[PDB]
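B., you asked whether I could sanity-check this one before it goes into the benchmark set. Here's the sequence:
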Amino acid sequence: ISVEELLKLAKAAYYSGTTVEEAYKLALKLGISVEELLKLAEAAYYSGTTVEEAYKLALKLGISVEELLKLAKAAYYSGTTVEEAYKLALKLGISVEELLKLAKAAYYSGTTVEEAYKLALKLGISVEELLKLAEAAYYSGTTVEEAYKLALKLGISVEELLKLAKAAYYSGTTVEEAYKLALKLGISVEELLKLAKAAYYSGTTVEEAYKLALKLGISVEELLKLAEAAYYSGTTVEEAYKLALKLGISVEELLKLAKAAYYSGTTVEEAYKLALKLGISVEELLKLAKAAYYSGTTVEEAYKLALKLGISVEELLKLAEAAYYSGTTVEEAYKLALKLGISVEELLKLAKAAYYSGTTVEEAYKLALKLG
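And here's what the prediction gave me:
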């Protein structure tokens, strides 16, 4: 089989507590594909059965493997069995995808699936809207009908209520308080949620974060990026902005530099200075920083490694993860890729497969070849 198929087989074998070849011959005995086997393995895991029991279950209900997996998840969320979940979908005359959404809503509400459905009918709303309402009610510690009553009293939509409930959660206020805050600042619900996050990252209030954005003359999206950067660096938002201006870079570039510095254990200025010394971009530096983290090396060491092997920064990062999955060094992983005649991306998939099945990358490769 192909490397992509082996990885999927290895995931299925991991979910079902078997071996890769046993999973492969199971797929043959059931006359199904590798992708279907994985979903079955995932469905069997949710329902506490075996893969073949899950397949018999799908045949008995007359549904597809994809439908079974959604039904298995719905049964998991509701605390019932697949068949009890199916009987309920039949009684309400809904699809399995609507049941899964309904089951998620009931889970966020601490009610039963049918109770959630009766509520949806009472409020006269769709299953998708109820689910958003349920999440909003969960964030704001109220009931679904209270959340629905609130959205009507504020004259806003269910989607807007949910974002508002998330903003109130970030800023430690109530939903109505969060709404008044949006009107007070003259911004949208979307802008408030981003502003609430920025205040959360920088340890300030929503209004403090807003005054800062006004003083710096930046968007709330730029502020949120700046706040994340300041949080990665251990500086203040304003300090991060002054740094970006000093280095003459954009807010997006500073955030990436901040991430890179966080991985490398350096300051943002040194990360930017390192990128100049190596003559590479901020994006390339961040990938190098990630690679050096997987390898237990420094960023410049990781760069010399890419030069030595004659590969790109991207190829190194994938190679670094493959080495991490195997417990080997980057050069041992590269030597194996060379011996097997495979690409770096194929090695990474092989390394994950080898990790999932508890074998060696080479052992996994020989297995894929045997399976044809």
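One thing to flag: The chain has 24 helices and no strands. Otherwise nothing jumped out at me.
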